Amino acid sequence: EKIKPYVRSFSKALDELKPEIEKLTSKSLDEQLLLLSDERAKLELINRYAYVLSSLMFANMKVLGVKDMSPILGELKRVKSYMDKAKQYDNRITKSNEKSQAEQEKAKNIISN
Amino acid sequence: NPDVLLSRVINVVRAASSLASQDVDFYKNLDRGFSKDLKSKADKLADMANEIILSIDWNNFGNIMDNLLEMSDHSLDKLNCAINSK
């Protein structure tokens, strides 16, 4: 009775995500990188594969019902921390290009001035 | 695509968060077949976690997360030479 909605509901979410997994691991961790050239295009693919797996191993560990969840939780803020870094790096790439194009527009106006 | 499939991951993350929130042992008492269905729904998890085991192919698990994050690090250091030298 009480378990009867949630267990079929969550399994349907597994059923929802189950084709998404197979399209995610369609081509290999080498292949899906080796087809790509930009390391920025290589970047989050490493993360996102780990990003799901982190939640995946946090999910299945609940099914054993083990009272500990720390040594995957200890891995959790790690994966955040590396996701924290290159975004702030990629923020700085903007300011490299954001202001250099204003340098482009300014010096043309100087001869115009 | 990140924003699509992770939104579906988030969808199942919350559903994974929705799983053992209820008291689960009570119908494991009331039948094995609740537990066995919960075992069978874990057999999805025995398959769906294995998909990325297949991508490679607990103490097993403690190994490769290094080797996952191994390859994260050599990006930014190359990105350091790709950008800070640039």
């Binding site: 009480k2 939780l73 959790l76 | 988030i10 993350v13 919350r14 968060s17 929130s21 008291d23």
Partner: peptide
């Protein structure tokens, strides 16, 4: 709405 906060919420519990 940082994308690790879904690890942090307490679920809907009966």
């Amino acid at each position: 709405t940082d994308l690790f906060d879904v690890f942090e919420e307490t679920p809907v519990e009966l």
